[PDB]
Amino acid sequence: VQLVESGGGLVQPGGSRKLSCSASGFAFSSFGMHWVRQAPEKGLEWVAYISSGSGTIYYADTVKGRFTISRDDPKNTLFLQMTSLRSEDTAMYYCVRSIYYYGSSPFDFWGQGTTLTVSSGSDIVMTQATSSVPVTPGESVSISCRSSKSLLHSNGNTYLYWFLQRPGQSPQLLIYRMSNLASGVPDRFSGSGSGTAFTLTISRLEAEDVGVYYCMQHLEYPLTFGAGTKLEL
Amino acid sequence: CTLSAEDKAAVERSKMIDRNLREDGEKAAREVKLLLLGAGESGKCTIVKQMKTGIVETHFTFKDLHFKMFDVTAQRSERKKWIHCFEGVTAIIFCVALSDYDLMNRMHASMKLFDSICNNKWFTDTSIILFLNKKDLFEEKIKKSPLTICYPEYAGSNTYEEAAAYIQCQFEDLNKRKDTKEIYTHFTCSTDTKNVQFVFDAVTDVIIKNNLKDCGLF
Amino acid sequence: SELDQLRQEAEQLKNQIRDARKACADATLSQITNNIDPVGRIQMRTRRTLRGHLAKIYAMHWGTDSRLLVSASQDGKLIIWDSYTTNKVHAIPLRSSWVMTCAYAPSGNYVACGGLDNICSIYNLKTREGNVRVSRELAGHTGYLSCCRFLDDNQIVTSSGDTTCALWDIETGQQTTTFTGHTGDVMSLSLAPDTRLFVSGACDASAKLWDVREGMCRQTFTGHESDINAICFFPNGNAFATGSDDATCRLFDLRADQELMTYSHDNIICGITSVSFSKSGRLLLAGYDDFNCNVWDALKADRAGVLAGHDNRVSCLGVTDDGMAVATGSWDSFLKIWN
Amino acid sequence: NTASIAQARKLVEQLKMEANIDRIKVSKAAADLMAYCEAHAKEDPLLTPVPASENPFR
Amino acid sequence: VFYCLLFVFSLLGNSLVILVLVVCKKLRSITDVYLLNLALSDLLFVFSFPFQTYYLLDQWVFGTVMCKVVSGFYYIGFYSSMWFITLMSVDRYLAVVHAVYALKVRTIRMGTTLCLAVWLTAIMATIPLCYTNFKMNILGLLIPFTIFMFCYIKILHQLKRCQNHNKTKAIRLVLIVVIASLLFWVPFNVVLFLTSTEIISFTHCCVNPVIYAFVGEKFKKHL
């Protein structure tokens, strides 16, 4: 299972560039696909989504009417056509696969991402208070976040996802609902919370789980991340 | 509409699954499903090799018909517990060796099996195709050892063209529902090319019969 | 002379087993439960109708989470259903369309399926590639598979059409234990709540109690007159109920070694295809050939409800682990959730 | 038929294993089933039907 | 002043047809789709029937949209019934002759698209048309019945060579269809051509549910 994003480079402002992500190693046709970007000093923000079978296409109300997402099912690439690139679009663009059925794990695999460098209202606001938390291994870390509205939908599900971005690597899914632990993830990580207040708890630390954590809501489009909490030392 | 985003995408997944199921069902409805039966030591393997561990399925196309035979002779179980699975086949190919009249005997077992499948409650409207096989060495087996060994009530001559027709009439008289279904019958051999043309013509008449039943003309 | 000697010895042993079962018979279950309150008319409405199959549904099985269920039909498809929102979670294309059973693993990770190909196929639901995938093909029977039930992710027990039940090992792929002793072919099985014993009903009108560890037949129950098509443990694990082609359901008893009740009515002449208890064990559900599904209370043989609403034979039935629902499947290609 | 003699020996050994078991009376186990049905009646959503609030299908 | 019971029993027949096809979910085949659409066309024509009868006083809005609604229901029913019988003739031609190719062609969605095409062409034909006739005569007699008679003559020549027990009843029902359609639509269009039979053309939409449903053993077993 891999996702190799390609394209990128130096683009003059107002120009155009098409990014590709050739998928390999999974059933690409049955996965919704997202493009999610990350400014070179800031955190993550969602850009675009195309569903399985191209039936539903969503944009982020900052690139809407300006970018174009499209997928190819026989050849397994994913395209993002971009026109009129302004100065606020320089970022590393990650591709991330996402399946939706009952009990599935959306946003579980992230592409490595490619860099793009340009020259020259009613949303839900994720809020993480702590920007940087210094800590030693072996301790227990409780990272909190809050929302604008209640992420607990009427069907019982609470749509808050916890991610992890290692230094120099793509983000990884940790918790794929309010309390559901993802696959390939150790038992140390535990998500909890209620309503508009949530907490990820690390029971004991290692050296490899340092880095920036992000929280995402999947209750309503557009998908909004939080300003991530950094863990060093 | 009081659905979350993942609920809407799950509904979209379910609708795409629905489209695939409808496409697969309307593709499967264009195929001719044949049930292959027969007694022991039949010559069905020869005509299967011409047309080409419980059910040996055999898919083959012929004149833009996609046949799928289901060789189930070899499923040595109680037939009354699984024969209702084949309710809705297009026809039934039943294979009898003609030379099994002297080897009760094998021919009366063939008649009992044909009477069991023909008058069955699940195949009241199913036509039966009947290959009377191994007719070549039957014609020299009836040189000595007459049909009185198998059928003692037989009073005709010891020739081929009368005894074979007598065996055909003895198998076709086992049909109780002679109005609902037909019994197609073909004298076949091991070196016989036209064994797929006969089953093609028989299922053509069966498809025309089902279309007359469906279109209100019957 | 040796055949007649062991013949008369087996007759004497059957006579002393019958004498022991007669000596244990001091009072019937009708005589004790004549003072309890009879249950009312069990009115159950069709909450959900699951409409995706295009041929006759032969088996279903509930999930442990009481929301997901699998169903097998002979259109060549195996469909995971979300019972709350009527969504199809998975649609599994089968290599052999002639299937007669299906099972849902209690972990939820796997789904079994088998039929007239003599092969129990194990399907992996949770893979990294996103699609379902057949993991093992358990090919060791010579008769058709009629039922299969997971013990865990690594062990499954199948009943077949060659008078033989078998205990499988998923990782290796061979029969760990072979259960022989029936003379007619086995049509159903049912695991105990503690996965240590299972019962099995065959076409010789006998239901046998099997021990999974030692691999022996412990007890044998003969009360029917025709082929037992369905069997199900009581929730206590000390009893079970069989459904046969003689239009009767019978409640057998492990410790009393004989039957307790007969669930019959004079207007019923068709065979039972499926049977299940409720969560309390008070109600007894049973699927029929006359397109209905009747509900007895198990403590007294009187019909307390009818689940009418199918247009062909009710071939499979499942009461969920919470007791909230009853999914009835039938040959009209519809599943129905009752509550 | 020596194989039929071995089959009859296996059958009479199975009947000997079945005959030498511990059996209780029918009334005691019938009272046990009655007690299990009486002690779990409140937890049965089909025997006593649940209200439509926590009913997951309505 | 006449009997005018044609409304009274044709409403009952077409209502029983649509009841069995729709209220009981029994719409599996393309022939059920064509029969439902022919029964809807017959109900529209039979609904336009009694407004013309007993036309002594003009209490209803004449010269404006209401009389236009009556005349529109009349002519939409006429063309839709005539075209649906020709679609059923083509479908029965494909179901008997060319039975292999009918497996690819005769689907439910193709039937619904042909039905919606018939309804839209009927509405577009009735837009130009409370006191043209050659177009009426052509597109309701000549172009339909050439197709109709060609299909049923080929159906008869094919059903003369089949197994006996089904083909006898099939030839009888085909001859019933042909004789009834000719005796119900020839003198009506002859009288219209001479002016440029009425009761006979009304009675055709009464007889249509009987012939196309009630003699078929499929519909009998649905009942």
Side-chain angles (χ1 to χ4, degrees), chain A residues 1-4 6-40 42-60 62-74 76-87 89-119 121-129 131 133-138 140-149 151-205 207-231 233, chain B residues 1-22 25-30 32-40 42-48 50-51 53-56 58-63 65-75 77-79 81-99 101 105-111 113-124 126-135 137-142 145-152 154-157 160 162-172 174-181 183-218, chain C residues 1-128 130-170 172-339, chain D residues 1-57, chain E residues 1 4-27 29-65 67-108 110-223:
Chain A
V1 175
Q2 66 181 357
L3 289 168
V4 178
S6 66
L10 278 76
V11 178
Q12 289 84 17
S16 295
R17 184 62 61 88
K18 182 176 74 174
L19 265 64
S20 297
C21 181
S22 65
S24 178
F26 54 86
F28 177 73
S29 298
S30 64
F31 287 165
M33 302 302 288
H34 297 269
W35 286 96
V36 171
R37 70 186 176 184
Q38 184 180 5
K42 293 176 70 68
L44 296 170
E45 64 180 1
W46 176 71
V47 175
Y49 165 65
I50 185 167
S51 67
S52 66
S54 298
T56 301
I57 291 171
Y58 285 154
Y59 295 100
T62 308
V63 303
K64 185 178 179 181
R66 195 180 71 197
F67 290 177
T68 301
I69 184 171
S70 66
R71 67 187 297 165
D72 195 2
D73 288 332
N76 289 319
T77 60
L78 176 70
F79 296 104
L80 183 64
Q81 181 66 42
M82 299 185 294
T83 59
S84 177
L85 290 173
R86 66 182 66 187
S87 179
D89 291 332
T90 171
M92 185 186 289
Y93 289 4
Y94 294 102
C95 175
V96 47
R97 65 104 182 267
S98 175
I99 194 170
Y100 298 99
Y101 54 86
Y102 176 71
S104 65
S105 296
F107 290 87
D108 53 353
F109 188 75
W110 287 73
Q112 295 296 321
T114 182
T115 63
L116 181 66
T117 60
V118 295
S119 179
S122 178
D123 297 334
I124 301 168
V125 177
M126 292 295 108
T127 302
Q128 298 182 1
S131 295
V133 176
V135 71
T136 62
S140 296
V141 177
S142 296
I143 296 165
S144 179
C145 70
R146 65 183 183 272
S147 67
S148 296
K149 65 187 289 185
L151 291 176
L152 190 146
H153 196 269
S154 66
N155 55 4
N157 290 319
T158 302
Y159 301 100
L160 183 80
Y161 297 6
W162 289 99
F163 294 98
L164 160 55
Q165 187 177 5
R166 274 77 177 270
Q169 292 180 357
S170 66
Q172 294 180 356
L173 177 66
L174 298 181
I175 311 297
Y176 66 94
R177 274 174 187 88
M178 186 182 72
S179 64
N180 288 319
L181 184 66
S183 68
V185 179
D187 204 4
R188 301 174 295 171
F189 295 152
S190 178
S192 178
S194 66
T196 62
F198 303 101
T199 300
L200 180 62
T201 60
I202 303 98
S203 296
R204 74 280 307 277
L205 276 78
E208 68 268 13
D209 57 354
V210 298
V212 183
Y213 292 183
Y214 295 98
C215 63
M216 188 191 74
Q217 60 91 31
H218 204 283
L219 181 64
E220 293 178 354
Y221 286 93
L223 305 175
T224 61
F225 292 93
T229 300
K230 184 178 184 292
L231 276 73
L233 182 64
Chain B
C1 62
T2 67
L3 271 70
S4 66
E6 299 185 359
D7 289 331
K8 291 181 178 67
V11 171
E12 185 179 1
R13 179 178 174 86
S14 179
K15 289 181 182 179
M16 187 175 176
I17 291 171
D18 287 329
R19 289 193 295 270
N20 289 117
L21 288 177
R22 290 187 291 111
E26 71 183 3
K27 184 175 73 68
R30 292 192 295 270
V32 176
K33 293 174 70 176
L34 295 173
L35 178 61
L36 179 62
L37 286 169
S42 297
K44 57 98 176 178
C45 295
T46 62
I47 64 169
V48 166
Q50 289 177 356
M51 291 177 185
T53 185
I55 293 176
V56 179
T58 301
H59 295 85
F60 67 99
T61 182
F62 184 76
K63 291 183 183 292
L65 281 178
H66 296 286
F67 300 98
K68 47 177 73 176
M69 294 187 289
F70 300 110
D71 192 2
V72 80
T73 59
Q75 182 63 255
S77 298
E78 291 182 355
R79 191 178 295 113
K81 304 302 290 184
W82 55 264
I83 202 170
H84 57 83
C85 297
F86 294 98
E87 183 183 4
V89 295
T90 300
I92 294 171
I93 296 171
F94 189 73
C95 298
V96 176
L98 289 174
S99 66
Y101 71 100
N105 54 2
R106 293 179 182 177
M107 188 65 73
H108 290 88
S110 298
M111 290 178 69
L113 181 60
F114 185 78
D115 198 3
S116 179
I117 65 160
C118 181
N119 298 320
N120 196 0
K121 63 184 287 185
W122 302 107
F123 299 110
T124 59
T126 299
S127 297
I128 295 170
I129 303 165
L130 180 63
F131 288 99
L132 293 176
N133 202 356
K134 293 181 181 179
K135 71 181 180 67
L137 60 94
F138 173 75
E139 194 271 331
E140 66 183 2
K141 187 180 282 188
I142 60 170
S145 69
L147 192 62
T148 310
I149 298 169
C150 184
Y151 294 101
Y154 177 71
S157 67
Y160 172 70
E162 187 176 2
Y166 182 76
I167 297 171
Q168 179 178 1
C169 291
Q170 289 294 321
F171 275 95
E172 290 179 354
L174 294 173
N175 193 2
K176 292 181 181 180
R177 295 177 179 90
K178 293 178 72 68
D179 53 354
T180 61
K181 70 177 73 176
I183 304 298
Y184 301 94
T185 304
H186 185 70
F187 292 161
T188 185
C189 179
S190 64
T191 63
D192 191 75
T193 305
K194 296 180 177 66
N195 289 319
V196 68
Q197 186 67 42
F198 184 78
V199 65
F200 176 74
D201 293 332
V203 303
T204 301
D205 288 331
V206 171
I207 287 169
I208 291 170
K209 183 254 183 65
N210 292 120
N211 288 324
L212 291 175
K213 187 180 290 293
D214 185 73
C215 292
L217 292 174
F218 181 74
Chain C
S1 66
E2 185 67 28
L3 190 146
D4 292 331
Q5 189 268 331
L6 294 175
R7 184 72 176 89
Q8 293 179 356
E9 186 69 27
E11 288 292 328
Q12 191 269 330
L13 266 64
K14 288 181 181 179
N15 287 319
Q16 70 182 358
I17 289 170
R18 183 180 61 84
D19 288 331
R21 292 180 182 178
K22 184 174 72 175
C24 293
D26 54 353
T28 62
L29 182 52
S30 297
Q31 294 178 357
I32 297 170
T33 59
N34 55 2
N35 291 319
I36 65 170
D37 290 331
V39 301
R41 299 293 297 165
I42 304 299
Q43 296 294 322
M44 293 173 69
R45 283 89 169 92
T46 304
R47 293 287 186 264
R48 302 291 187 272
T49 299
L50 306 179
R51 50 175 69 89
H53 290 288
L54 295 175
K56 298 188 285 185
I57 296 170
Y58 280 90
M60 56 75 56
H61 197 195
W62 279 101
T64 306
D65 56 353
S66 296
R67 182 171 179 170
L68 293 173
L69 70 154
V70 65
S71 68
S73 64
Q74 285 186 354
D75 54 353
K77 299 293 183 182
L78 188 66
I79 297 171
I80 305 293
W81 294 93
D82 191 2
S83 66
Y84 290 178
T85 63
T86 322
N87 294 118
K88 297 181 178 67
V89 180
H90 294 283
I92 304 168
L94 298 169
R95 292 182 65 189
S96 178
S97 66
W98 301 104
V99 297
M100 293 176 70
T101 186
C102 65
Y104 196 84
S107 67
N109 294 320
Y110 294 99
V111 167
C113 186
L116 295 172
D117 55 352
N118 318 131
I119 292 170
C120 185
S121 296
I122 303 299
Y123 291 96
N124 193 0
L125 297 177
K126 296 182 183 293
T127 61
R128 295 293 301 274
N131 54 2
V132 294
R133 184 180 64 191
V134 53
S135 65
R136 300 294 296 165
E137 291 180 354
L138 300 172
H141 289 293
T142 60
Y144 63 95
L145 268 78
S146 64
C147 184
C148 62
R149 289 292 181 267
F150 284 98
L151 295 176
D152 56 355
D153 289 331
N154 202 6
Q155 291 176 354
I156 192 171
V157 54
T158 62
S159 68
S160 176
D162 57 355
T163 71
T164 298
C165 294
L167 179 62
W168 294 92
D169 186 75
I170 301 297
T172 59
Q174 288 85 18
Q175 292 181 357
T176 300
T177 303
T178 301
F179 300 99
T180 59
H182 286 285
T183 61
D185 51 351
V186 185
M187 296 305 294
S188 64
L189 65 88
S190 177
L191 293 175
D194 47 350
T195 61
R196 190 178 294 275
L197 300 173
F198 71 100
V199 293
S200 66
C203 290
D204 55 356
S206 69
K208 290 181 179 292
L209 178 65
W210 298 100
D211 197 355
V212 177
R213 298 291 186 269
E214 284 82 2
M216 64 182 180
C217 179
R218 188 177 297 275
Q219 292 172 357
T220 302
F221 297 96
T222 60
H224 284 282
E225 294 178 353
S226 181
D227 302 333
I228 295 171
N229 290 319
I231 201 163
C232 181
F233 264 99
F234 193 78
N236 197 3
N238 290 319
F240 65 98
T242 60
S244 178
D245 286 333
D246 58 354
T248 61
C249 291
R250 293 179 186 271
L251 179 66
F252 293 103
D253 197 356
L254 276 73
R255 294 179 293 173
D257 206 5
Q258 61 183 356
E259 69 180 2
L260 296 175
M261 296 300 290
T262 302
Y263 302 101
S264 66
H265 187 74
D266 291 330
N267 297 114
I268 294 167
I269 60 170
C270 64
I272 295 95
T273 52
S274 62
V275 67
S276 294
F277 282 97
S278 179
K279 184 175 174 65
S280 175
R282 178 64 181 268
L283 295 177
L284 178 64
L285 271 288
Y288 274 184
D289 297 332
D290 63 355
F291 303 172
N292 291 321
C293 173
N294 289 326
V295 180
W296 295 265
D297 46 352
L299 298 177
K300 55 178 73 175
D302 49 353
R303 184 179 66 189
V306 177
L307 272 66
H310 289 285
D311 291 329
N312 204 351
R313 290 175 63 185
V314 177
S315 64
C316 56
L317 196 156
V319 178
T320 194
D321 288 330
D322 290 335
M324 290 291 171
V326 174
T328 62
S330 175
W331 286 359
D332 58 354
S333 71
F334 297 111
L335 292 160
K336 288 184 182 292
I337 287 94
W338 299 86
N339 196 359
Chain D
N1 206 167
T2 307
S4 179
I5 299 299
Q7 190 269 332
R9 186 179 296 113
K10 180 69 172 66
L11 190 145
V12 71
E13 183 68 29
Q14 181 63 42
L15 290 176
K16 189 181 290 293
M17 186 63 72
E18 185 179 0
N20 296 115
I21 62 171
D22 293 330
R23 293 180 181 91
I24 64 169
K25 291 183 182 293
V26 174
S27 178
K28 276 79 176 175
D32 288 332
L33 294 182
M34 183 178 72
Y36 186 80
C37 292
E38 195 271 332
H40 290 82
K42 297 182 291 294
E43 296 178 354
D44 197 1
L46 299 173
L47 185 63
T48 62
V50 296
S53 296
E54 67 269 17
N55 193 0
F57 291 95
Chain E
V1 176
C4 297
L5 296 173
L6 297 174
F7 176 78
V8 180
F9 67 92
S10 183
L11 177 65
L12 191 146
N14 292 314
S15 67
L16 286 175
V17 170
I18 294 175
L19 259 281
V20 174
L21 289 175
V22 176
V23 176
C24 295
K25 189 179 263 78
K26 292 178 180 292
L27 197 64
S29 178
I30 184 173
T31 306
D32 292 332
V33 175
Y34 286 159
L35 181 60
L36 176 61
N37 291 311
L38 182 61
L40 288 173
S41 303
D42 288 331
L43 278 186
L44 190 62
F45 188 78
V46 166
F47 283 164
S48 179
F49 174 72
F51 291 161
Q52 291 180 355
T53 65
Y54 288 158
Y55 195 69
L56 298 175
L57 292 174
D58 294 332
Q59 71 270 13
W60 290 334
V61 181
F62 66 98
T64 323
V65 66
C67 181
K68 291 178 183 179
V69 162
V70 174
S71 179
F73 286 172
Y74 181 79
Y75 291 113
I76 287 169
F78 158 78
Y79 274 115
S80 292
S81 69
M82 280 292 313
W83 286 112
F84 282 135
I85 79 181
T86 69
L87 285 181
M88 294 185 76
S89 71
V90 175
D91 181 73
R92 289 178 180 178
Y93 172 75
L94 289 175
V96 176
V97 186
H98 307 287
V100 176
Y101 181 67
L103 293 175
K104 294 187 286 184
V105 171
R106 291 176 66 248
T107 61
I108 296 98
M110 186 68 203
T112 58
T113 56
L114 289 174
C115 288
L116 292 176
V118 165
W119 285 108
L120 289 175
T121 52
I123 294 169
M124 288 177 69
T126 57
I127 283 171
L129 294 175
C130 296
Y131 290 162
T132 62
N133 296 115
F134 292 99
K135 183 177 75 175
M136 288 290 293
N137 206 168
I138 291 170
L139 293 174
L141 186 66
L142 294 176
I143 299 171
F145 277 172
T146 52
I147 297 170
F148 189 82
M149 293 301 291
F150 180 77
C151 289
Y152 280 110
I153 285 168
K154 296 296 182 182
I155 285 168
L156 285 172
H157 290 172
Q158 187 62 254
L159 288 173
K160 285 181 181 179
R161 294 181 290 112
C162 288
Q163 73 274 14
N164 300 111
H165 184 272
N166 291 310
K167 79 186 184 181
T168 53
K169 186 176 180 179
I171 288 170
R172 287 194 296 270
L173 291 178
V174 165
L175 288 175
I176 286 171
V177 171
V178 172
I179 290 169
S181 178
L182 288 175
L183 291 177
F184 288 163
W185 291 112
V186 170
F188 181 71
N189 292 118
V190 168
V191 169
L192 288 177
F193 182 74
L194 290 174
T195 55
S196 179
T197 62
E198 184 72 30
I199 306 167
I200 300 170
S201 66
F202 286 120
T203 313
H204 177 76
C205 297
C206 309
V207 173
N208 285 325
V210 175
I211 289 176
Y212 290 105
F214 286 95
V215 300
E217 292 181 355
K218 181 179 179 181
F219 186 79
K220 290 179 182 179
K221 291 180 182 179
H222 293 301
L223 290 174

